[PDB]
């Protein structure tokens, strides 16, 4: 079709499983974009459809904290998803690099994420795979803008209707309700936001074990705490939000909207 007509590729930015992301420019506009190139030829049509579903969802979502999709193109043997360019690498990488975030930075960061989650939810979309690996930083500076990525596992809900949408996500960040093979919805993303905030503050996750069966027994039982010395200095407000995010029953758990009104996010 018309991709190698309008854009021109430069350096590789990352490999995925089936994919390769590369900085590209729209040659008429002179506009930098990130281009995720996928192999049609290595993929059944069932999986062509799985991809055109990802693009459909990404284009309902115009938001300052969500990597916007500008175009989506089928050529012979390749597919091109044109995202906003984000040069500051994964949130994960920058957390490792800085060991942990200050409450002030962690708040500014989780706030932006919650905003993104809220917009997803009010547009009838649940991400089901929130983790710092799927959050790109605008730059590597200390209070940087964070946009949300990969809706490869994102689903469509009708209103607050819960349902069994299958067993999917990342084991660290899975909801009790999903492991328990109960029906679920928007709250699964707020559970993940719980995990991500915790990581953000002290540099490790509230649930971990090398043996996955134990990791799951941990999550189901709401088995997190705030160890010493490092959590002793951290405000009780910060703790409170995490406690309302890692509430084990999903109906008593805090919503994206409730979360954005919490003192620890909206103070002064």
């Amino acid at each position: 079709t018309r991709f190698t007509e309008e854009y021109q590729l430069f350096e590789e930015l990352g490999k995925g499983a089936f994919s390769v992301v590369r900085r590209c420019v729209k040659v008429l506009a002179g506009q930098e974009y990130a281009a995720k190139i996928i192999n049609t030829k290595k993929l059944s049509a069932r999986d062509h459809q799985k991809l055109e579903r990802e693009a459909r969802i990404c284009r309902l979502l115009k938001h300052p904290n969500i990597v916007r999709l500008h175009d989506s193109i089928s050529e012979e043997g390749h597919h091109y998803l044109i995202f906003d360019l984000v040069t500051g690498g994964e949130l994960f990488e920058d957390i490792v690099a800085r060991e942990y975030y200050s409450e002030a930075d962690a708040s500014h960061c989780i706030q932006q994420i919650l905003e993104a989650v809220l917009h997803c939810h009010q547009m009838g979309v649940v991400h089901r795979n929130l983790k710092p690996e799927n959050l790109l930083l605008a730059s590597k500076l200390k209070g940087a803008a964070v946009k949300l990525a990969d809706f490869g596992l994102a689903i469509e809900v009708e209103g607050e209707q819960q349902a069994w949408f299958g067993f999917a996500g990342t084991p660290g960040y899975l909801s009790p309700e999903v492991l328990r093979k109960d029906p679920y919805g928007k709250p699964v993303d707020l559970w993940a936001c719980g995990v991500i905030l915790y990581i953000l503050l002290v540099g490790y996750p509230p649930f971990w074990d090398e043996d996955q069966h134990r990791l799951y027994k941990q999550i189901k039982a709401g088995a997190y705490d705030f160890p010493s010395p490092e959590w002793d200095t951290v405000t009780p407000e910060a703790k409170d939000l995490i406690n309302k995010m890692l509430t084990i029953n999903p109906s008593k758990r805090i919503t994206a909207a409730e979360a954005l009104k919490h003192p620890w996010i909206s103070h002064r």
Partner: peptide, 19 residues
């Protein structure tokens, strides 16, 4: 195996594939 120290627990943080 991690110790009862902040420096130790920070090794529990690795990237994770999906499923």
């Amino acid at each position: 195996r991690t110790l009862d120290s902040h420096a130790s627990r920070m090794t529990q943080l690795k990237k994770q594939a999906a499923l």
